[PDB]
Each structure stands twice: as C-alpha cells, then as structure tokens.
Design a protein around this ligand. Structure first.
Ligand code: LYS
Ligand code: LYS
Ligand code: THR
Ligand code: THR
Ligand code: THR
Ligand code: THR
Lengths: 397, 156, 397, 156
C-alpha cells in the first residue's frame, strides 16, 4: 500500500524533530509501504521570510514574495532526505516544480490544477521515499507559487488524489477528532471513523491545524484522511466516506436576526439576504417557516462581531419591504447533533428534545439536515445542553 | 452562473406537517415529536422559527407513505396541548444546494433565492446546515426550479 | 549596451545593503543600459545552511546538500527584485532552472555546460532587469546543483559570455587591481586596463574575492571584466584583451628543489617530475638549463608546506637515476615583472637586473615568459626587491 | 590525452646563447644583458639555474637575425668578466603548452615530458610561467614533437 504523510512546522521545527520524523517514516517503509512525505518549513521561517519582505514593502510584490517564502520548504525537504538517507532509507527530495504541481497564477493564494504522477511513481517503484515540498507549485508560465495557509495540507491531499494513495496522514498535536470539545465535556472520546460529511458538519473541530479546505478536497476525490498526534500515541481518526450519533457540535459566537411580518411573495427572501451578502457579513443559519395570512418571519444568524451591522441593514430592509419589524438578540448559543444514521432511524430528534426539556432548557429555533439537528437556546445553557445531550446519546466515557 | 457548488439535490417524496400556535415552553418540541417517533414514523426536515407573544409554529416533514398517520397524531397532539391547528400538505418538494462551503452561506443562498425569484417560484420554507441550503416549494415547480438552479450556479 | 553585474555576499548582506545595490542598478538602467544582475546569498546564509547539514551528517549527501544551500541565493534574488520594483524599476528574479543553466553532475562542484539566452533576452527586451541566482544550475536530469566556491563569479561571467554582454562587472571591497600589493608598496596605483594574461600572471592579486577560474573563463570567451569597489569610488580596473610593465608580483611561500648532475637523456625530465605529480604536490617553477658533459641540473619550486615531501621524493630519484645529489632550500622568494609590451621592447630585463644589482641583491634563478621575467632571491630581500623594481619601472607615478 | 590545455605554440625563429662559468655575484646578469640591450637586441627566453661552486650558467634567446651580433657581444663579455666560454646555437625550436592553469603545472609538465620522451626527443631547456610550460629542442624534431603533444593532450 501507498501512504502519504504530511508534517507540520512543529513536527519539523528542529533538526532533532526532523530526525524523529525520519525514524517514524522509517517504520512505515520498513513495513512494506511506499511513502510520500510532505513537509513544511521549519518553525519561524515562513513568518521570518514574510517579515523580511514587509521589511522591504508594506504590500510586498506577490510574484516575488512567492519565490522568497517558498524557499523555506526547500530547506526542509533536503534535511529530512539526508536524515532518512543517514538512517539507511533511500529518499529523494522534490521541488514543487520537479514533481510538477501545476497551479493558478494567484500568487500568494494559488490553487492546484494538475499533478504529474509519472516522476514520483518511478521513484516509488525504485524503492525510494519521496519528500515533497509542501505549499508550493508553479503556474503555466514557470513562475513559482504558494498555496496559502494550509497549503501543505492541500499538497498532501492533492498528492494523495493524483497518486491514488490508500490514505493521507496529517500529523499534528491532537490525537484525533473527538465526540465534542474535551474542554467542555471531559468524557469526550476519540473517534475511530467519521465521514467527510460529518467532519464538515462539526465545524468547530475545524481549526488552524487542519484546514477545512483540506477536508473538502479529500471528499471530492474520496481520499481517506487520518488525523493523528505526531508521535503515534494512537491510531488517530480516519475520515473517509461510507453509534446513533457521531458527535455534538456547538457555537457560542452567534447572534440572531429576525424580520417579522414579511410579505410572502417570490423575491422577498432575496431582498432580505441580498444586502447582507453585499456587506460581506457571514451568515450561518437561515430559517423560514410556512406563511400564515400571506406573511411570514425570516431569521438568520451572524457572528457577534457583525451583529449590529446586520441589524441596521435588516431594519432598512424591513422599512423598504413593509415588514412589521426587525429584531435581534445576541444572547444565544447554537447546539447540534450530527451523525449519519439519523436518516435511517426514527426518534433521534425526539431524544434530543427530551434531554433538553429534562434540563429546563427552552428551544428557540430548530434547523435541520439529513444528518444534523440544530437548536438555538439562551447562551447561559450552552455547556449544560452539550453535557445533557452527551450523556443522553451515550457518548460518555 | 459562476458560483461553485457540489450539486443540486431534491426529494419529491415529502409531506409537510405544521402545528401552529404552540405554547413556547420547554418540553413542547418533545410532546409534538415524541408520539410521531413512538409510532416509528421517520422525520426528515424540522423547522421552528422564533416565538412571538409566547407561541410558535413547528413544522416537520415525513415520507409520503406516513403522511396520513403523522397528520392524525399531530392533530390529536394539537388538541391535547392547546395549539391552534394542525395542517398538512402533500404537494411540495425539497430542493437543496450542496457542498456550499461554510463561510459562503450568505452568497450561495442569495443566488439561490434570486434564481427562484426570476421564475415566480415562491419559497415556503428555508433551512440551513453547514454544507447545505435547503428550500421547500410547491411540487409542480420542481423542474423549473432545478433548471433555474443549474443555470444560476456552476457545478464543481 | 548590456552589462552584467555581480554582487557578493557582503554586498547583499542586509536588507539595507540590498537596497543600495538596487539604487546602483537603477542608475545604470536609467542610463539606457540593459542590466542582468547575479547575486549571492545574504551573509552567513551559505555557511549557516552547510553547518545545518553537518548537524545531520558528517559527510552530508552531495545531491541533497545542493538542494539546501541553493536556497540562499533564491531569497536574495527576490528581495532585490522587490527592492528594484519599489524604486520604480521593473525586475524579475530567475532561479537557475528558469534561465536554464544546464550543468554537470558533480554536485557540490558543478561546472556550467550551457546557458539559454532566449528567456533572459526576452525579459531584457521587455525592458526589465533580470536578477539571477548565482552559484546554481541543474544537471541534465533535473537535479539542483551548486557551482562550488566562487560560483557566483562564474555565473556572472557565463551569463556575460552566453549573452555576449559588453562587460561583466564584479563588485567587491577592493578598488581595482593594483600595480603591486599596497601593503608592500604604499605607492601602488590602481590600473586602468590589463589583459587577462597579465592578470593571471600576477597570481597573488587573485584573492578569494576574484576567483582565478573566473578570470580564466572570461579569457576563453573574451568577456571584458571589471572589478570595482561596491560603491563606485572609481572606474575600477578593466580586464580584457589586447606602460613598460604592468605590475610586480611576488610569492613568499616557496621552496626550491634541485637535483644536480642528472644524465641528459630523453625521459629523465619525466622521471624527475612524474613522481612529484603522483603525490599531488603543486609545482610552480620548473627551470632547466643546457647540459654540459651530458649532465645538467633540474630545479623546481613548491609551496613550503610540501617541501619535505618533495625533497625526500627527489632524493630517492636521484638515487634511482644516478644523479650527484638532490638539495633543497626554503629561504627563497619569487619576484616577477609582468607586462605586455615587454615583447615589443628590448632591454626590459636589463633594467630589472640592474635595479636588483643596485640594491646588492643576488639573483639565484631566472625564469621567463614573453610578458614576464621571474627571479628567485633570498627571502629577506623580498620587499626591497619589489620596491626597487617598483620605482625603477616608474610605477610610483 | 586527458589533460585540458588551451593550445600548443612553437617558435622556430630563435637562437640560443649560453655563457658558462660566470661568477655568482650581484650585477653579473646586468653585465651580460646590459650590452645586449644596448645593441637594441631583443631577448625572449632567459634561463638561469642555481649556482654551484660560486659559478652559474646563463642562457638567453634572440631572434635569428640577431644571433651573430648577440654571439659576439656575449663572447666579449665572457672574456671581460672571466667566464669560461660563450657558445651559441641556431638549430633549435621553442615549443610551449599554453593555457595551463596555475594549479596544474605538475600534471601538464609530467605529461609533456612523457610525450616527448616516448619519441626520442631530448629536452635541453625548460622554463615556466603561470600559464605556460616551455621547452627547447633541436629544430629537426619540431614536427614530431608538436604531433606528439597534440596526441597526448586535449585542446579547447
Ligand atoms: N426521525 C429523526 C429522529 C428523531 C425524531 C424524533 N421524532 C431523525 O431521523 O432525525
Ligand atoms: N623583451 C624584453 C624582455 C625579455 C625577457 C622576458 N621575455 C627585453 O628584451 O628586455
Ligand atoms: C417550542 C418548543 O420548541 C419548546 N421551546 C421546547 O423547548 O420544546
Ligand atoms: C418569503 C419569501 O421566501 C418568499 N416566499 C420568496 O419566495 O422569496
Ligand atoms: C634532462 C632531461 O630534460 C632530458 N634531456 C629529457 O629530455 O628528459
Ligand atoms: C649570475 C647573476 O644572476 C648574478 N647572480 C646576478 O645577481 O646578477
């Protein structure tokens, strides 16, 4: 089997760290696995080089910035090849341009267009470990490019798709993706497998370490993704596609906006949300129930930072379209159960509502998906709701 | 005609149930859906907007084969808890934009509502998820709505 | 016209320093000159990268070492491109692979085989300044290579040859090449022009600053070479092809070996020097005069570090070929006059011997070239001989 | 023929002059070459090896047109300063390897002496410069010597 492994800046932050990465990679190769390793620049180099450029200009030239920042990964790919060769395991380093990770022309934010499997496949069949520079490529004209944040993660997943790897392993600080935030529920436990769809629905698990885009890419190409702690304490979590509920997700940074008595006619929903979109306000939830006497209510949710901007915009719309009023509330939290199998089982929503009612928590809003039920409650109840649902659905440990 | 999405999905086998003027107090959502679940009727969509003057409306969807059954349980619940009425509809379709992207809900939903609006398709219900925006419309307009959405967006 | 400029590590040591070179380049470009600039890594970067590799291994893998050290120049080319753009002069950086500097495979010591002029010529005709990373290229298989010490000097001259530039400018600390070492003769003068042949003949004027190989290369392809102080105090010196004597050269690190009474038969000269060459002793001077009674003497000169090795090898040979003795002396100095036009005029050697005779200096050995006379004298007289010759030839000027 | 050099040069217009047993004391090279220079005779090669028993030999070369003039001046100087004799030769040629590389005199010279020794060409004089190794041989052997050097070396 073929495996793609990606190592973050911390993992390769020092020579001592790189030597350790090599030792592990040695173990996989020793097991009969062909290995492709994706590495990032050692810690501080990417920020240090960017800082060197901003030292030169306030808005540094995107095309030239790419050739500066891209060098960091090139130092790293060589050291790990050396630390591997020293350990008796053959390795070859690859530049972005050497493999041929063909990309966009958007300079500090380039997107992968095509990856040549021919040169790497030959190195793998010759028994060598391929060490690829993460976060780089070149456009159709030969100009160097950088992917953007999470670029290395993207590269690893893109290599996994083009090479049709068995799985792509992302090494990081966390031991996996958990049933819920362990800071909130100490009995939260590590998950063995979840679908791409479940992982995306539990957004807050999405963070700085694993970029959301990476989860998105692997899903498009059915790339088995494993998240593990760098030192293999455990198997990690396998995110692939195929326990009544997988997990509990929540968001405390929410504010709700409702426009009441809206005329129930085509185009009105566009009038409500259109101007919000024009202002670049992120919208999370949108809820509209059935009209009565040709009027309805329309509610959506935004981050607290943008609450008043969205509210003043909505008040304008309520004046424009003749609605009864526009009102908002920032004292809310969103709590969700996600899991496949919700689709095949009756009563999952019943059990969630019962568990909230046992705790005297009033449900203000309900929104849904095939694999998700979301509830909006008063912010004070957030941790209690999360714990109530967590024992109720038997995820406790 | 440029925005990116994974696909457009729809379901013609859906029936809408609404219980209106339900008291906005803890335990009610369970009283409504508890007996539906006890009968083993599967539930797909559930929509509840904010309460006004201490009552709210609660809507859910079921497979068409369970409509008449769910309707009567809901009607009996409506009388038990003092709700105003229980109403049902079988002539609806659920159409969704999938693979939306979390930070982009305001963009794709704006385009979808716009596309529907160009044709005169009235939206009766809206629900959201991290990766989906879903709409409920009268069933007869489905084909026009799907064609409008295919023109409005770019499939990935 | 087209000028190629090379700036070393000190010249691009800091961002502040890089900024000035850009100003320097700006002036030329504004004058109607197409400019190609070759730059080195920022100060300390090349050594910092090597030491990072020795950290991994005792003998770091040559092919992978090339991938790491080459990155230093790649940072520098972008910064100077950015520093040029800010100033309002368009620039594009070129990695070695981009221009296409094709090379050899000797990884840490690669030799340039071919340079593509097409892409650079295009950027120049578009009116941009092309900044090329010195000291790197790629072999025929796509492997990154580094030129070795003095690589950037080599790169600039190679670009000058392949582009048929009007001249190649080497920027460094010295003001030019002098009549003689100023430490010895404070009245030494900066030279305007000397031939490649004179410059090579004055070997000690070639420091680490100007690699001798770089001068050799320029000579084979008639690349006019100028050496200047980085801040254009003056015209520098021009070395190209084409004053009684140009300069005075000397070497204190010498030792003479003589084998006396050698049989004057074909093949004996091979017997004397063959084994010296086998031991890798570098030899400077070789002097043999006409035989008398079918025997002659054979003398050569070596660095003092190799003296005892050479002497003991010679004694053995003297024994083998039946010579009368082999003798050595470490208490010698070599002083030379070099100048073109020596070929043209009579009596130049007379004047050199007279000046040494005025000073009571005994001449022990004489060796010659069309443009050079070399003398070997007692070591104590080195500075005096150089001064006497420097005034005799009116170089004080 | 592995070694690289720039080329093979030779000069057929040369005449050898040697004054033998000259006292090894300062000013003597000027006394020998002073009058030659006074006659305006140009000099090319000058070769002097180390003194032994307070005398040395001193050889130089001039254009063939000037041999007879140089020979007599040297003969008078030889008588003036007490040298043993002054002798001349016209039947000689100068052949040189150019483009040597200062680093490689030992290697190129070993190869040049070997190629000449494989033919039976006796080397009578050897002189050196930073970028050149020079040999003097009987003129009749010039063609054979040049071909041998070409065979033994690789040119640029
Ligand atoms: N049928 C629900 C389960 C809970 C419903 C309770 N009536 C679902 O699949 O989400
Ligand atoms: N031609 C000069 C120098 C000859 C010695 C070096 N080739 C002279 O006759 O003085
Ligand atoms: C309205 C209904 O949802 C009620 N708030 C509940 O908590 O069940
Ligand atoms: C209420 C609003 O959704 C309207 N029905 C529409 O179709 O836009
Ligand atoms: C003395 C030595 O030079 C000899 N004549 C030779 O030709 O090798
Ligand atoms: C012999 C000759 O070289 C003499 N020694 C001189 O010094 O002029």
């Amino acid at each position: 089997a073929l495996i793609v492994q990606k190592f973050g800046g911390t993992s390769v932050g020092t020579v001592e760290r790189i030597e350790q990465v090599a030792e592990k990679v040695k173990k996989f190769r020793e097991a009969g696995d062909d290995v492709v390793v994706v590495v990032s620049a050692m810690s501080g180099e990417t920020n240090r080089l960017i800082g060197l450029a901003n030292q030169i200009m306030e808005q540094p030239v995107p095309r030239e910035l790419d050739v500066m920042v891209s060098t960091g990964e090139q130092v790293t790919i060589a050291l790990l090849s050396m630390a591997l060769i020293k350990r008796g395991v053959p390795a070859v380093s690859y530049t972005g341009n050497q493999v041929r990770i063909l990309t966009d022309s958007a300079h500090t934010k380039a997107r992968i267009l095509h990856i040549d499997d021919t040169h790497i496949r030959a190195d793998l069949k010759a028994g060598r470990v391929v060490v690829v520079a993460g976060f780089q490529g070149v456009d159709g004209n030969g100009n160097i490019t950088t992917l953007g944040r999470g670029g290395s993660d993207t590269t690893g997943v893109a290599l996994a798709a083009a090479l049709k790897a068995d799985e792509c392993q992302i090494y990081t600080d966390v031991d996996g993706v958990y049933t819920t935030d362990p800071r909130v529920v100490p009995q939260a436990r590590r998950l063995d497998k979840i679908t791409f769809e479940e992982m995306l629905e539990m957004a807050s698990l999405g963070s700085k370490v694993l970029q959301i885009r990476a989860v998105e890419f692997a899903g498009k190409y059915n790339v088995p993704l494993r998240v593990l702690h760098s030192f293999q304490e455990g198997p990690g979590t396998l995110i692939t596609i195929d326990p009544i509920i997988s997990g509990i997700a929540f968001n405390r940074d929410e504010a709700k906006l409702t426009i009441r008595g809206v005329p129930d006619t085509p185009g009105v929903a566009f009038k409500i949300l259109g101007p919000i979109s024009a202002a670049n306000v992120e919208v999370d939830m949108i809820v509209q129930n059935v009209a009565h006497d040709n009027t309805t209510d329309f509610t959506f949710t935004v981050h607290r930072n943008d609450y008043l901007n969205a509210l003043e915009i909505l008040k304008q719309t309520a004046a424009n379209i003749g609605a009864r009023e526009a009102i908002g509330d920032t004292n809310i939290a969103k709590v969700s159960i996600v899991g496949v199998g919700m689709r095949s089982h009756a009563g999952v929503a019943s059990r969630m509502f019962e568990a909230l009612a046992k705790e005297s928590i009033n449900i203000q809003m309900i929104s849904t998906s095939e694999i998700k039920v979301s509830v909006v409650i008063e912010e004070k109840y957030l941790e209690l709701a999360v714990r109530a649902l967590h024992t109720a659905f038997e995820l406790d440990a | 005609e440029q925005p990116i999405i994974s696909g457009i999905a729809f379901n013609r086998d859906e029936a809408k149930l609404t219980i209106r003027g339900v008291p906005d107090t803890p335990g009610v959502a369970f009283k409504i859906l508890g007996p539906i679940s006890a009968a083993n009727v599967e539930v797909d969509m559930i929509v509840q907007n904010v309460a006004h003057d201490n009552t709210t409306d609660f809507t859910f969807t079921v497979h068409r084969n369970d409509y008449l059954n769910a309707l009567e349980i809901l009607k009996q619940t409506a009388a038990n808890i003092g709700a105003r009425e229980a109403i049902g509809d079988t002539n609806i379709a659920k159409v969704s934009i999938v693979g939306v992207g979390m930070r982009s809900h305001a963009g794709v939903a704006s385009r979808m509502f716009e596309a529907l609006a160009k044709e005169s398709i009235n939206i009766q219900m809206i629900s959201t998820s991290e990766i989906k925006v879903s709409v409920v419309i009268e069933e007869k307009y489905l084909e026009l709505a799907v064609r409008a959405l295919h023109t409005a967006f770019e499939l990935d």
